[PDB]
Symmetry: C5
Subunit: 307 residues, 5 copies
């Protein structure tokens, strides 16, 4: 059971893919273990650089393949180095950029918060053959968050576990568990742009829609209702052209639907108010009371919506 | 006739491209067979990792090439391993990400349901030379479907078959059959987003369009009809900018066309009512009757559509 | 002069790029010739798979390079095999996916019809050194055309030709000709989507635009004309955001221009009728006349255009 | 100083990237020089194909690296061949597809005209070590200009020069010169599409905007002005969504700004006419003057700006 | 401590990605150091080209791997050469294209100013093993800035520093410092396009929106306000579809929000004027006053909001 100590440096996380639930991570990976002692040039450690590494494998060196479980396709392995010590220690250091997978819930967008995970596991060697001892994940402070799309909330959380693959061969008695490293980094989306350039104008438009009941004529009210409908449609289009593709309704989508329904209920109430009573009465109490009740009814419906 | 037992682990299915009829599949592939026995270091099984694999082949090891039939270009094979047992067993294990093709019908979108298929076949060796014994496909449960784009409905269906290529050589007596593994996985699209953010606003706009006959003046009616047409145009624009490119009409496209035809028929009826009777009679009976005859008749039209 | 018999299996054609005039083609390529006999294990033919291929070339085996002339960049070569027969026969079989070029005229879109071409030619060896004997192009029937964007109409047309590169050396007497295989596949675009969601709504919008002359007042007519102009603009925008990039006007672009001109001529005719006569006359007869002359006149203009 | 004669075949130029000032070039490159004589298999010249080339380099063959200076990243080198003659001649032939950069000015778009340049230079050897003797550039006729986006004006123009890199070491006396081949191909953009589907509808919209002064009432004029503003806005959006991204104002952008300013000046003139006279006399005389003075000053500006 | 002198030639900077804070840089990298003398053919230095370089490493040539710190994934290594001198000097020259990251603040867009940085560092060798001696950064003048997207303001600033990695082993006394080269290039964005086609039309639209108070009727004012709102919505749509994605509000976004607020305050003031005094007195004094307070107050608040 070989003891392996790892350390993963994280340079950047970016490239959010909402539909595919992937994210790009660039950083470093260090893995250290202890092998048979060896003679080096002098007693100083030996340095082996990318191509030369393969040579040592062809001559019998054991370098285990550590696979990113949650990765998406072969990542872009940058420079890689082996440091070989005379006492047998071996250190594998590699720059890596890769697309990783994780369950991501975007329903509370733009106020969502996610957690980027990394999953390391030996590809061929089990835990009875090769064991994980140490994890250390370092994230740069970068406290000037205002510029970045995402805000990291705390340093990385680690988790070593043992994964049991049930569905395997039947001649292998007990060598079916593997040592898996899982790294989690919580982060929150910066909603400033969506607050100011999406939410605030939408609320202003809906308030303007409420301002329809201050028209004197019925024809004016009903005709302007369609201008309001078209306004909401154009705004929803601008929205959808900017916002990311998704298979569920975002919060902004819900505000859009709320504006649609408010205008629809306004049209219904306008028609009803004009054609309610007898003796050619428009029920002036209904119109001039709705002129202030409609904002409060909608605000109560929205405070119930946030639940 | 070599008996090969395979096992395909499916990690993720995503990236549907509607125009190309492709979908990306990331997972593992395992293949086991029995060859001539071999001496290993001790009687313990030997493990060979990516680069060294090629070396063993150059010294005479026979590793057959298994091609994904329905694949699109060279897939991205990640880490790969050979496990060699002293009794002759050989196991090939490889991580793979690839884009696959299949007939996909999106006419009932966004309520469509598809089936992702995989087709494995030996590239050069026929069925009289190399045979498939077992198929085993494992899919993760992933029971929090509400977030995922597609909902897997059931376990995978497998089928070993014999494929016969007619157009071949003329010296080949009986070596013209191949062993093909076929895996099918049914799936259904999540229609929530298109129901709430597309279907509901489209229907609400169509109802608001119906509300034109409740106008008193004729000029108001005809002038407002054009604002309604422009609303439907902007809505169809927003729709088409979001929805996937396709060569046929989706259900939503049909609803857009239905809104167009509804407004056009409304304009025709408005003109008819204004100039049906003599001496400039409005024919208010027609206007009042269609005020509620358009909804029932159009729902009947859509019902005869759906069936 | 080596006789080479080829066979090209065409699995799928897709991914047309209008601006680049490229299209993606995935299939197989087979090339067969007869060489000096060779010793195999037994008298059964020998099979060589991807990597080992290079070894055989390095030991003196002659494998000619066949270049796709009309391809765009290095294609994605999948699995490849060499079949070596004891009598000297050699068969090269390779899976290939590539982007190919051909002159493509999209003026009649969405009613255009194109033909996908493939051009094979030996890269270095001339016709006095290497000759093409047979071509056979196989495409699966796939008679369920309704799903696919393009409809293949008949089997591929083949043509062996000899191409003479003029600009060559001046000491070379006659070794300047090459054997080129040309494959052509005619196909027609499925216009259903563009028929129903583009052409039909456009005609409906243009007829509704003509319906402006049924307004009683002049001011109503002129004010509504601008709502119609904006409607056409929004429609052209929807179109252009959806339709493929091109450097020339499609049929749909001309229909957009036709709607533009119809609305503009309508505005011109409205002003003319308002100010045709002296003493504040409206020339209502002109409005009544154009009310039906615009359908007839514009459809006569469209039918003269379609000749 | 070795004399090297090259030959560049140009198959296609496409894929202009406006922001990056890049263009895709697909063609062939041939380079010939004369070396020490050599023994061939038989007395006929020997042909070496892609993979074998590297082997021949390891055995002492001198093949200089010729770099495309203005290229962007590693181009896609397809098949490459060495033709070795017994008299010592060496010919390197390779298919190449690459993205190239050059100063491109798009200010007069869609009436712009550009020139595609290619820049070849030996990577390691100077002019005293390796010299360019001949250039021969072959460009396809492509006389079906109506379909192609760009019109080539003439065959390629070439220019060999010697480049001196100032910023270098101080021990190198005069070996700081390199032989650079420069190929230039002038071309003019076909403006038909942008003329008919962009310029003409925009001018028609602006003329309709001029038609505001023929409204009788003041309220009609001022209220219609805002729908006209909205029309220009929607058109400008359609424009910018189709037209290529750029860091400067195109001619079409200038026409958009001209329409905007025309509508704004129209609003100014409308309000001025309404309140130029005391007691708010409408001053219809000003409207009757400006209705045909405004297009006059506009088209005067349109002819002036051309200078 | 090996002294290494570098030289970085910068060919082009482009491809700014606002969300990822990356930019593509193409140029050359030169590295010079002095090793033990060597026998060459003659006294002229020996030149080694790309592939052969790798061979020389397997036979014992020491070429240190220098990594770009701020790069994103393996850069696109073009041609590379080794020049070996008899006096012991060794020079590595390589063409490179890569994606680089740096803190980039786009808040003052379109007047933003950024700085493109490059960070060079040895991958495996520390400063006691390998040191940087000289920096020389050469940038082409390119003084025709008007065409290019970005304008470089001054020549590059260079800086050698020593970077200390804390998290390392604990037996290593002082081998925790590395020699880092830092290159900074200030640059300013070309605002012409965003000035003329975005800022100026937006200001004209806002002034036109102010021109609503010159309407005589109350209904005219209130109904026209909604057309103005819709105009602002379409304009914001056009902007956001063209402008680059960002997580914060640009200056242009602030102007859009300001137009929104102007229209909303105009509606508020209209309603207030309609119901300011008893009996729904319209308060013509309020309209007179606001006709000049709204523009002047907007100028004052806009001048306040920038300091
Ligand atoms: C309006 O808001 C709308 O409310 C319903 C009910 O939550 C949601 O509807 C969706 O979520 C709920 C659960 O939360 C599911 O039971 C429902 O089948 C699904 O369609 C829409 O996603 C949301 O947009
Ligand atoms: C109206 O909606 C539209 O009408 C017709 C009805 O079939 C269909 O249009 C299509 O129909 C069938 C295919 O099913 C074809 O024979 C027909 O040539 C084609 O135009 C569209 O699929 C549908 O979306
Ligand atoms: C208006 O319709 C549009 O007008 C232009 C000008 O003719 C045409 O464009 C083309 O027309 C004819 C071809 O016969 C040529 O003389 C012209 O140079 C070319 O631009 C479009 O094909 C057509 O769609
Ligand atoms: C309106 O057209 C617009 O006018 C201005 C002023 O000329 C131009 O502006 C451009 O040229 C002028 C000089 O001629 C410079 O002062 C200015 O810095 C530059 O951006 C725009 O590029 C052009 O699109
Ligand atoms: C409109 O103006 C809008 O005001 C808010 C709050 O000031 C800004 O929002 C941001 O900027 C300011 C700093 O200037 C911060 O205090 C605020 O917490 C932050 O969310 C938007 O970036 C800006 O676009």
């Amino acid at each position: 059971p070989v003891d392996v100590s790892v350390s993963i440096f994280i340079n950047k996380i970016y490239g959010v893919n909402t539909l595919e639930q992937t994210y790009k991570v660039d950083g470093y990976i260090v893995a250290q273990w202890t092998g048979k002692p060896r003679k080096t040039p002098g007693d100083k450690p030996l340095i082996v650089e990318n191509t030369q590494i393969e040579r040592w494998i062809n001559n019998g060196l054991w370098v285990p393949a550590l696979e990113f479980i949650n990765v998406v396709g072969s990542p872009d392995t940058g420079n890689k180095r082996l440091m070989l010590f005379p006492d047998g220690r071996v250190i594998y250091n590699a720059r890596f950029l890769g697309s990783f997978s994780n369950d991501m819930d975007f329903r509370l967008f733009p106020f969502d918060r996610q957690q980027f995970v990394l999953e390391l596991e030996p590809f061929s060697y089990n835990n009875q053959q090769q064991r994980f001892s140490d994890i250390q994940v370092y994230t740069e402070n970068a406290d000037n968050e205002e510029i970045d799309e995402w805000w990291i909330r705390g340093k990385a959380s680690t988790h070593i576990s043992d994964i049991r693959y049930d569905h395997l061969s039947s001649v292998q008695p007990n060598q079916n568990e593997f040592s898996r490293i899982t790294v989690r980094i919580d982060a929150v989306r910066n909603p400033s742009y969506y607050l100011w350039s999406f939410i605030l104008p939408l609320g202003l438009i809906i308030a303007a829609s409420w301002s329809v009941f201050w028209l004197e004529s019925f024809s004016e009210r009903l005709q302007t209702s369609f201008t309001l409908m078209l306004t909401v449609v154009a705004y929803a289009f601008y929205t959808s052209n900017i916002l990311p593709r998704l298979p569920y309704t975002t919060v902004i989508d819900q505000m859009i639907i709320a504006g649609y329904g408010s205008i629809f209920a306004a049209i219904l109430l306008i028609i009803f108010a004009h054609h309610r009573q007898a003796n050619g009465v428009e029920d002036d109490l209904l119109i001039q009371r709705c002129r202030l009740a409609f904002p409060l009814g909608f605000l109560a419906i929205g405070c119930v919506l946030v639940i």
